[PDB]
Copies of this chain bind each other. A is one copy, B any other.
Amino acid sequence: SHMTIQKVHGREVLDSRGNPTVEVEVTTEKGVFRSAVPSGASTGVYEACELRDGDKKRYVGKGCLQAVKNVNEVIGPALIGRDELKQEELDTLMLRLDGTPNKGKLGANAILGCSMAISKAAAAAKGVPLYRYLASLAGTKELRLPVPCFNVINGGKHAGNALPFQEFMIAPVKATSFSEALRMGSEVYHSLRGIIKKKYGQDAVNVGDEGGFAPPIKDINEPLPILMEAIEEAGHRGKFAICMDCAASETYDEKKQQYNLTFKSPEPTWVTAEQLRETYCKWAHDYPIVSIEDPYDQDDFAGFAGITEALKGKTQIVGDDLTVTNTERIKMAIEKKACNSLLLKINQIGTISEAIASSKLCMENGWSVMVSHRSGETEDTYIADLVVALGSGQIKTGAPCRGERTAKLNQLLRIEEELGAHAKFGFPGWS
């Protein structure tokens, strides 16, 4: 009938690293609703299946023709004529079409694009913006613009440097609006570039996958003074906090049960989890570090729990690979008091309904939720709407550099403008 889904079409497009990913368009009488799927590099072993073709003759095996075929030939034909308003029903249909816990049959990258585009078609059907529609789905009482955590010095897996830990971020927590937050973040970012150029030279100011600088730094402590210097120089002393994403699993050796802090270097530097805790306690004390994500390997619940307790009320501990936006893993984390913040990645789980369920479970258990991009992004801006819709007050979506990051930041500007001067900003705990 007239208001239902008319067409569903997937296509392979490129992500911000030039790798294929999936985009889906759901067409209704209200228009064409397009959603693209991001792709991680430091993907947790428990993430929902990202289905790649493995054809060495295309994109050296990273094609998404099969996931796209799954959208075009399996999921889409199922959705035609369906009521896009029925988000849970359609997500559940898609889960059942796949029939596997990890979305390994159809691919989470086939499913998620559908889930996303359905929600956008549904928002259009309701005649509200996506963030309003998602807030209704989530039962969110109060929308808010999030404080952005800007990953401004890039390290880890496939950043061009020795730096083993992945993200050194700045967050304008004392900004009083998103507009002001974004400008401050950009201003610090610009100061930071001059600071890095002066200290490490010209060659040090090219950018990593998420638009942070990729200076030739090996030691994980070295970026922090630089961050404080840039904050100061930009004129924003006292306005900012620091967030870390260690992505510690990427450095972890399971057999040795130790972390290699020079895993991108010829010689290894094996450090224990107890040595890491010392480092994190020192970090939290020496700097305004309000968030540490994946400080330990993804199955080290005990390490996570120890640092969560140690930095309780000072520094939230964010599960990313630990939790993989998955209520099963989240329940394990709650049971162990392993962390108190969810990094919410729609493509870690693969449907909007499930991502929303994860956010609600975390918040009911008193965690914060930081909606997140992946290191492989697109021009898609869904997470801008999603973070506002969840009212979580926290987003990480890149340095204020590179279009696949600024697209989200800009969308947040647009949402902020729509919500007007009484719209809440930031994370109350950090304000």
Contact = CB atoms under 8 A, between A and B. Distances in A.
Interface in A174-201: 182-183, 185-187, 189-190, 197
B378 A410 contact: yes
A404 interface: yes
Nearest to A158: B205
A203 B203 contact: yes
Contact of A160 (B203, B211, B235, B381): B203
A407 interface: yes
Interface of A: 11-19, 23, 31, 57-60, 159-162, 182-183, 185-187, 189-190, 197, 202-208, 211, 214, 216, 235, 264, 377-379, 381, 399-407, 409-410, 413-414, 417
A363 to B, nearest CB: 30
B160 A14 contact: no
Looking at A31, A183, A203, the one whose CB has the most chain B CB atoms below 10 A away is A203
A290 B190 CA distance: 36
Contact of A202 (B161, B399, B406): B161
B16 A58 contact: no
A14 B159 contact: no
Given A16-B403, A206-B207, A59 B183 contact: yes
Contacts of A406: 13-16, 18, 378-379, 403-404
Contacts of A159: 206
Contact of A23 (B235, B404, B410): B410
Given A18-B190, A414-B11, A160 B403 contact: no
A39 to B, nearest CB: 12
A197 B160 contact: yes
Given A31-B31, A402-B404, A404-B406, 5 more contacts: A18-B211, A160-B206, A203-B203, A377-B403, A403-B405
B403 A182 contact: no
Contacts of A57: 235
A208 to B, nearest CB: 6
Contacts of A216: 203
Which one of A190, A410, A413 has the highest number of Cβ atoms from chain B below 10 Å of its Cβ? A410
A206 B202 contact: no
User: Looking at A183, A379, A400, which has the most chain B CB atoms within 10 Å of its CB?
Assistant: A379
A58 B183 CA distance: 7
Contacts of A16: 401-403, 406
Contacts of A404: 379, 402-404, 406
Contact of A410 (B206, B207, B379, B410): B379
Contacts of A185: 18
Nearest to A416: B11
Nearest to A404: B403
